[PDB]
Design a protein around this ligand. Structure first.
Ligand SMILES: *[C@@H]1O[C@H](CO)[C@@H](O[C@@H]2O[C@H](CO)[C@@H](O)[C@H](O)[C@H]2NC(C)=O)[C@H](O)[C@H]1NC(C)=O
Ligand SMILES: *[C@@H]1O[C@H](CO)[C@@H](O[C@@H]2O[C@H](CO)[C@@H](O)[C@H](O)[C@H]2NC(C)=O)[C@H](O)[C@H]1NC(C)=O
Ligand SMILES: *[C@@H]1O[C@H](CO)[C@@H](O[C@@H]2O[C@H](CO)[C@@H](O)[C@H](O)[C@H]2NC(C)=O)[C@H](O)[C@H]1NC(C)=O
Ligand SMILES: *[C@@H]1O[C@H](CO)[C@@H](O[C@@H]2O[C@H](CO)[C@@H](O)[C@H](O)[C@H]2NC(C)=O)[C@H](O)[C@H]1NC(C)=O
Ligand SMILES: *[C@@H]1O[C@H](CO)[C@@H](O[C@@H]2O[C@H](CO)[C@@H](O)[C@H](O)[C@H]2NC(C)=O)[C@H](O)[C@H]1NC(C)=O
Ligand SMILES: *[C@@H]1O[C@H](CO)[C@@H](O[C@@H]2O[C@H](CO)[C@@H](O)[C@H](O)[C@H]2NC(C)=O)[C@H](O)[C@H]1NC(C)=O
Ligand SMILES: *[C@@H]1O[C@H](CO)[C@@H](O)[C@H](O)[C@H]1NC(C)=O
Ligand SMILES: *[C@@H]1O[C@H](CO)[C@@H](O)[C@H](O)[C@H]1NC(C)=O
Ligand SMILES: *[C@@H]1O[C@H](CO)[C@@H](O)[C@H](O)[C@H]1NC(C)=O
Ligand SMILES: *[C@@H]1O[C@H](CO)[C@@H](O)[C@H](O)[C@H]1NC(C)=O
Lengths: 118, 409, 48, 48, 97, 95
């Protein structure tokens, strides 16, 4: 009852109490991250995809095909359901490549051929 | 010690020992402008006068993250294909249930891997590893299946199948013990192997400080980040730590100079953090190179290097995954239950000296035999297991005795 | 400012030199074992 | 000034300690393989 | 070199060579507050506002010291027991004195 | 001393000498057996025969040249003493 605001281990304010109505509010930092451009090379095409690292796609238009991964949200790549060898590593087991009209895809990494010794 | 006595083991023991090696550390990337001052435009404008003091740090951290991914890739990704153990698991008595994957669990990790896994912003972001834990477990399972089904072959060309009993016979022959020793003691050796693995699981479950290195790495990274965050909120000799008050309740000149001093302090803190991270990453890369070498030499083959792959005479090793690290289970052959004997450099039969082709002369006390140097299986001295060179005048310690010859019908 | 820049350059050069020295030690070992002999170590002197 | 001097000394000591640790690891390996065994690695345990 | 000639030794030589490796360095520890200003209270008060700068250096130096101890321990302590040579030393002509 | 101190090493020099002497005694008496399990005794002539056999030379080469090889070993050790005593720059790395 006598406490006003909360703190985490690193002495960063993460909760406050509204002075008028005695309710607890949770403070969350405004979303931020890096922007990564995925390109197959100018010698092949001029089409690129954009990755926003560690950011939800909901906050993306605030500041083509939308796909949300663990490393962030992939804008401009079509998620296939196959699995090939890693051409361009994105993160968390996701790789991108330029396959065939012509588009940039984003599959899941394949760990090589399947084998079973007799 | 004496000049004519030798001790030779009459039994053996199969011992399994673990080994923990960190291979990678968490990939953190820290922005420069956001950390120094993430909301004050004039502070960023002032910081712009320092040149490229914010691009070098980002480049270094990016290089460190790439290094971590490369470390994991080179340590674990060493198989061209993904091998699989057969559904029938009759390996002649050897029981690999503790290391083979468990399909019942959702994560498809083995027993020991589960034990290991359970046992173990002001502009800072933590990037995810490129290889998820399931892919690391898949690599580990592929290595285990290839080692169990094939042996040496799958790491040096086309994978070739061979029964596990015969693979173990080859590995025994590779340390100086014949095949009949394994073939005549298969059940005892299998029981010893299973008991050793069970003891390994129990020991890993009981002691709470076995996985010390990975915890050390995690704690060091966390402490560095916490120290950086604490250093963020310091005055550095200015009026107040927060620069919002400095820009509000002060004239532009004095506020500017205080902001400059705060910028210098925070830049020094960031530089120290980056330097420490670089040194720690170099240490981790050395450890990851060692782990990759051990995987190549102990897991994909049999190593004659002493004390490298375990403690004793190396037979085989099994990799196991761990959070930001790898764990090996070095199976080794240790002799036990020695017995005193009397030795002799050679034997004088018919005026000519006789030396053993392979082995050593020993004595019950009255007779003489030829036995292996590592295991005690005496056998009668014969022409086929000895070779003749010179007469009986130059060897210092020759013993008069008689040798037998097969050609006597 | 210039002293800070120079000191940062020197520290980076020192760490890079340590890395290159480790690589040179590895190359010397590979020359000693692979070239002057025939290694039985797996995957050291090539694949096979 | 004195803080800068101290941090420079500490950084140089850390790099030197890393080099010494690499040398100590090499010494431990040579003790394990040359002394307690008989190495087949060329030019590792002496010349010859 | 010719396609039918081979050279084979007829004798040998037992050669002994030395090799020197440094395994550890001197364990030092420098206090921060005392080194910067060991007796000035005003100086210590001013330094206290710089944050945790005298803790990181002490932690690094302590890590270096324990690393040196571990280096010596791992290089030398490799025998479980302490073996002793027999009092009478007749090793077939080899002299290890 | 301006606030700098030098801690003493945990293992004293006599303890390091004791480790080195134990290693030497184990090597002379046991061979390589003491580093991989129970220590098994063996005559030094026979251990050197094993070590000769390990590099592709038969045992009779040692057994028929034991005195010459022993003399060569002794002369080599004496030369090591002389070389270390005369040249004072050999210990470059520690210095
Ligand atoms: C501060 O004043 C506001 C405005 O009157 C209070 O909010 C009202 O509180 C009464 C108390 O029973 C409620 O019945 C009303 O429904 C509230 N109105 C609204 C719009 O929320 C508030 O409680 C006061 N806070 C304190 C600590 O006294
Ligand atoms: C080698 O040691 C094993 C023990 O590790 C011996 O096996 C034991 O033998 C006794 C009597 O034969 C049994 O009561 C035990 O149950 C056995 N233990 C195990 C684990 O099997 C074995 O006999 C020894 N070999 C020789 C030749 O003495
Ligand atoms: C391999 O060993 C494991 C454990 O050491 C065996 O699993 C045990 O099986 C019995 C009988 O079903 C159970 O009572 C135990 O609880 C099991 N242990 C564990 C840890 O789950 C397994 O049966 C062995 N392999 C074979 C083929 O028998
Ligand atoms: C010397 O070796 C012989 C051969 O093995 C041992 O004599 C055997 O002893 C067993 C048990 O008493 C008998 O069953 C065999 O018939 C004996 N064979 C021969 C050829 O004598 C003898 O025990 C050994 N010496 C010692 C001191 O143990
Ligand atoms: C192999 O070399 C050794 C010396 O390294 C030779 O021994 C020497 O022989 C000469 C000739 O008789 C003597 O004058 C020396 O005093 C010997 N030196 C030693 C240390 O004994 C040996 O003769 C050579 N082998 C052959 C077959 O000639
Ligand atoms: C091993 O070599 C040493 C050094 O040559 C021998 O020690 C010498 O022994 C003689 C014999 O009385 C003495 O006159 C010398 O003074 C000794 N030298 C030193 C430096 O002490 C030693 O005797 C040899 N070992 C054996 C078993 O003879
Ligand atoms: C891929 O799989 C998901 C889940 O089964 C499914 O919803 C989606 O339609 C699939 N896409 C294609 C192209 O098959
Ligand atoms: C061999 O003889 C020595 C002589 O004292 C003795 O100490 C040792 O225990 C004997 N070996 C065994 C295996 O009993
Ligand atoms: C062993 O030493 C004893 C005396 O110590 C001696 O009588 C015997 O001849 C020696 N034997 C050998 C083979 O050296
Ligand atoms: C061995 O036999 C030969 C011939 O019978 C003899 O000359 C020699 O003295 C014998 N050796 C011993 C040690 O009795």
């Amino acid at each position: 009852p006598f406490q006003q605001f909360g703190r985490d281990i690193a002495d960063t304010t993460d909760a406050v109490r509204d002075p008028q109505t005695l309710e607890i509010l949770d403070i969350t930092p405004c979303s931020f991250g890096g922007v990564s451009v995925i390109t197959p090379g100018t010698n092949t095409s001029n089409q690129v995809a954009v990755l926003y690292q560690g950011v939800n796609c909901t906050e993306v238009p605030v500041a083509s095909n939308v796909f949300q991964t663990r490393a962030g949200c992939l804008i401009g790549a079509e998620h296939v359901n196959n699995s090939y060898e890693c051409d361009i590593p994105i993160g968390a087991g996701i790789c991108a490549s330029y396959q065939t009209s012509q588009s940039i895809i984003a599959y899941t990494m394949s760990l090589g051929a399947e084998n079973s010794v007799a | 010690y004496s000049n004519n006595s030798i001790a030779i083991p009459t039994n053996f023991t199969i011992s399994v020992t673990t080994e923990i090696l960190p291979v990678s550390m968490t990939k953190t990337s820290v922005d420069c402008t956001m950390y120094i001052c993430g909301d004050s435009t004039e502070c960023s404008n002032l910081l712009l006068q320092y040149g490229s003091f914010c691009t070098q740090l980002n480049r270094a951290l990016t290089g460190i993250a790439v290094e971590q991914d490369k470390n994991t890739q080179e340590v674990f990704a060493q198989v061209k294909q993904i091998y699989k153990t057969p559904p029938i698991k009759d390996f002649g008595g050897f029981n690999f249930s503790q290391i083979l994957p468990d399909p019942s669990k959702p994560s498809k990790r083995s027993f020991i891997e589960d034990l290991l896994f359970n046992k173990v912003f002001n502009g800072l972001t933590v990037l995810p590893p490129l290889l998820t834990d399931e892919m690391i477990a898949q690599y580990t399972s592929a290595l285990l299946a290839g080692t169990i089904t094939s042996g040496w072959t799958f790491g040096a060309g086309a994978a070739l199948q061979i029964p596990f009993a015969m693979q173990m016979a080859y590995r025994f022959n590779g340390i100086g013990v014949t095949q009949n020793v394994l073939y005549e003691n298969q059940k005892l050796i299998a029981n010893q192997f299973n008991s050793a693995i069970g003891k390994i699981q129990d020991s890993l479950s009981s002691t709470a400080s076995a996985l010390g290195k990975l915890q050390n790495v995690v704690n060091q990274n966390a402490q560095a980040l916490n120290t950086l965050v604490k250093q963020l909120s310091s005055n550095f000799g200015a009026i107040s730590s927060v620069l919002n008050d400095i820009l509000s309740r002060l004239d532009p000149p004095e506020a500017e100079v205080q902001i400059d001093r705060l910028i210098t302090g925070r830049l020094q803190s960031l530089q120290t953090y980056v330097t420490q991270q670089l040194i720690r990453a170099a240490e981790i890369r050395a450890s990851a190179n060692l782990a990759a070498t051990k995987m190549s030499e102990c897991v994909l083959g049999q190593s004659k290097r002493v004390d490298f792959c375990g403690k004793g005479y190396h037979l085989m090793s099994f990799p196991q995954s761990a959070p930001h690290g790898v764990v090996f289970l070095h199976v080794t052959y240790v002799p036990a239950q020695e017995k005193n004997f009397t030795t002799a450099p050679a034997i004088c039969h018919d005026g000519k000296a006789h030396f053993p082709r392979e082995g050593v002369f020993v004595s019950n006390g009255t007779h003489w035999f030829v036995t292996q140097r590592n295991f005690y299986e005496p056998q009668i001295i014969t022409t086929d297991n000895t070779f003749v060179s010179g007469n009986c005048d130059v060897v210092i310690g020759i013993v008069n005795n008689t040798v037998y010859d097969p050609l006597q019908p």
